[PDB]
Each structure stands twice: as structure tokens, then as C-alpha cells.
A = this chain, B = another copy of it.
């Protein structure tokens, strides 16, 4: 949408409402365009209550 386009543009990343991006996701997982994965998932830490 337009708001995302404006926010991207103001962040020195160029993208216009008339632009399009074309991609191909490969079949074999060994060779791919973009690789994503989790090394260590989110771990919570609850610190004890402090003075004040």
C-alpha cells in the first residue's frame, strides 16, 4: 500500500508506487535466492523486582 511505499522512500530505500519487483523461488532447497532460518529462538528473561 501507499503508506508503506512512502515510509520506505523516506528511509533512503527507493521504491515507488509505479515500481514492481519480480522474483523466482527455486525448487531445490540447496540452491535458493533468499535463505532464512532460526539459530536460537526467542528466550525470555524476567528480572526480579528492584528497589523503586
A41 at the interface (CB under 8 A from B): no
Copies in the complex: 2
What DSSP secondary structure best describes chain A's contact surface?
loop
Residues B50 and A47 in contact, CB atoms below 8 Å apart: yes
A49 at the interface (CB under 8 A from B): yes
- Please measure, in the bound complex, the distance between the C-alpha atom of A44 and the C-alpha atom of B48, giving whole angstroms: 14
CB distance from A50 to the nearest CB of B (A): 7
Minimal Cβ-Cβ distance residue in B for A47: B51
CB distance from A33 to the nearest CB of B (A): 38
CB distance from A10 to the nearest CB of B (A): 33
6 contacts between A and B (CB under 8 A): A45-B49, A47-B48, A47-B49, A47-B50, A47-B51, A48-B48
